């Protein structure tokens, strides 16, 4: 109802399972505050690039602007933040991209990018961290890091289940835990408020399954649960049972044995992708210490958004870190890094977060060559060290580019 | 019962705050399962010599064995892995050091190291840490990183509050979850496992004042509350409001202006300390990122678990990293790795943490010259590149020392 949807221009398609893409797709894309306005255009402009190079011409992308944050509420009036159109259009659409987005303090509001994906049911978080050569790092050896997140998107204490200390709500349940349920382990049962973390068998395994499965098809070496399940035994520590238990009836897992930890054999490749599992504290020791031992990690909400932060730091790539929520209906790639209020129009930061969730989408499109291009362009502009403000700062020999520069040095080394 | 008291020796006293110690007290000390058998009696061995060489005589430990684990269901009978005079003598005695822990699975048995602080009401885990120069380092700057966590112990998720997924007791808090308080929000309530997180406001408000406090007294430049209440709002999100509340009520904060960062000054050094606050997951990248920007840190039980193994990664200390759980009425100091049972009895691993822990002991005893030599003696050993197997795996140059040894170098380097 103000979104102009392309003249030119045809719907991606799930016929069972399967995207069928056109040749001339129609792709949501929310432009995103703060910084949103300098990124994605940088974004639009490496895309179209890639696949007019790719593809000679034959292929082109139909791009419709659809609204969430700020932005939304300067175009359908001060109170709405997530247009309920968005919802039904991502969902329509099949696969859309965004950028940072804000949201309020001061009204009751949930933050709007757990909103989109709890709301859509987007229930992968995927975030590839991988190093590239030549990206400043604060470790001695970031090339060692070569590792995808599963995330698990939509329940532990991210559902939103809360009540505030002193609300009459939190003094009921906390009346009905010591009373109807005896507990006596609250310390401090007033001016307490309560959280609540979920965690189904349904939602790990539809999760763990995702991640094996990427597993076989991009035969990988392994798979790591990580859990504080011998603190939290019926969340975490289900979890971490519920993902080998998975692996052994679904993926034929074994026992290397002695055990705990499993064998599967991809079926395609031949190989053995071992199924393990790392206490979660140790494991943010691990990633740092013998990055080399892991692969594809398999995680709750809360510890997937801390492993994915950490380790994207580690590379050198908080600025560059790209993103998907994949739910079984639609795929959302994302800017992972915030607003940036005090740079936004300035063009100056880095537009290689949202760049990259662009190639991560055009490879879930089958769109692969365009795919190749960016990451292509990608090295080969850092490793020219034509760079933007926040890798020169790092790096000696540098040659300082704007954001919308960065998308044209892209370009070049596409 | 099975706890033979020094004959020579006195109890230390709480007299109102302020603790008196004796010239010869007698110090609980719980050695530990797995390599406690190993680190244990080389920390009773450099105390001695720390405490000999200090005082010249005057003053020397009355050590006194007692029981947790599973060498306490060898002393006392199959069933008992926490005997409840541990707790009355680690009260009585007001000092107590222990060595590592083993929790059985299959008894449905909560964690001990947990169950103590707990059961005491040990409130703080302090854990410094800082670089040892010459360990190896995974991070190019080690040197950056001098970080003192005060982690809350007595809520948070930790607190043990969780039914299995198809219980009864889940099957009931999920219907008065849903029924009751109308939660809408659990994706899968069928065969889901619920946890509890409780934060209460004089849980946090009791570990803010002691951060702040430590920051006086040592006259550290900040102290950050770490929380993730963006997405937590009513339990790390009130954290952090109870917090700079605290430092604004009892320490004299004012906005650094603008806000939302506060300014105490100290009153004693007539310097500032900066309290401000990060959502966690972007710590996690500041911390490798930005190492000197933080000094003292505040944050609740899980996100004090996470932090503080990271940082004693980075530094290269995940053997050597003492830690300290302090209550009004007794503190706790500990190693803080585990019980390594494929390396136990063969003199070894690292003693370095618990004997960290056991200069932190010293240091709050008032014994601080005692403490000084441990850490000379320390940093004497690591220096000589006289060191044991995991440190020299990632040397070159180094001397291979047992465990019992390293103690030894320690004692000559003071
Ligand atoms: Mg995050
Ligand atoms: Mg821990």
Redo the contacts between chains.
């Keep these: 109802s103000k979104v102009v949807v392309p003249a030119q221009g045809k719907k991606i398609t799930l016929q069972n399972g399967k995207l069928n893409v056109p040749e001339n797709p129609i792709i949501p894309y929310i432009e995103g505050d703060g910084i949103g306005v300098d990124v994605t255009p940088a974004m639009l402009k490496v895309v179209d690039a890639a696949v007019e190079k790719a593809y000679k011409g034959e292929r082109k992308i139909s791009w419709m602007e659809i609204y969430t944050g700020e932005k939304s509420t300067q175009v359908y009036g001060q109170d709405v933040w997530l247009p309920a159109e968005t919802l039904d259009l991502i969902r329509e659409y099949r696969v859309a991209i965004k950028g940072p987005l804000t949201?309020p303090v001061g009204g009751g509001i949930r933050?709007l990018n757990?909103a989109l994906r709890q709301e859509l049911?987007l229930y992968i978080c995927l975030r590839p961290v991988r190093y590239y050569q030549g990206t400043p790092s604060?470790?001695?050896?970031p090339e060692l890091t070569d590792m995808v997140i599963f995330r698990e998107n939509?329940?532990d204490?991210?559902?939103?289940?809360?009540?505030?200390?002193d609300s009459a709500?939190?003094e009921?349940?906390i009346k009905?835990?010591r009373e109807?349920?005896g507990?006596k382990?609250?310390?401090?049962?007033?001016?307490?408020?309560?959280?609540?973390?979920?965690?189904?068998?349904?939602?790990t395994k539809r999760l763990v399954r995702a991640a094996i499965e990427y597993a076989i098809a991009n035969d990988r070496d392994s798979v790591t649960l990580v859990h504080?399940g011998?603190?939290?035994?019926?969340?975490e520590g289900?979890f971490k049972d519920w993902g080998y238990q998975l692996a052994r009836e679904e993926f034929g897992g074994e026992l290397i044995d002695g055990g705990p930890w499993l064998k599967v054999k991809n079926p395609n490749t031949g190989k053995e992708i071992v199924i393990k599992d790392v206490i979660?504290?140790?494991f943010?020791?691990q990633i740092?210490?013998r990055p080399a031992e892991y692969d594809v990690i398999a995680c709750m909400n809360?510890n997937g958004?801390?492993i994915?932060?950490?380790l994207?730091?580690?590379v050198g790539g908080?600025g560059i870190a790209p993103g998907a929520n994949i739910g079984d209906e639609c795929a959302l790639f994302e800017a992972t890094h915030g607003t940036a209020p005090k740079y936004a129009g300035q063009d100056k930061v880095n537009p290689g977060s949202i760049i990259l969730s662009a190639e991560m989408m055009l490879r879930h499109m089958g769109w692969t060559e365009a795919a190749d291009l960016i990451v292509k362009g990608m090295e080969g502009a850092i490793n020219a060290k034509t760079v933007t403000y926040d890798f020169e700062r790092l790096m000696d020999g540098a040659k300082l580019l704007k954001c919308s520069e960065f998308g044209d040095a892209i370009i070049e080394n596409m």
């Design positions: 949201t933050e757990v049911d604060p470790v001695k050896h939509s329940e204490i991210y559902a939103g289940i809360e009540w505030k200390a709500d939190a009921k349940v009905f835990l109807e349920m507990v382990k609250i310390r401090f049962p007033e001016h307490c408020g309560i959280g609540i973390k979920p965690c189904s068998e349904e939602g504080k011998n603190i939290m035994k019926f969340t289900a979660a504290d140790a943010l020791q740092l210490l809360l958004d801390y994915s932060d950490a994207a730091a580690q908080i």
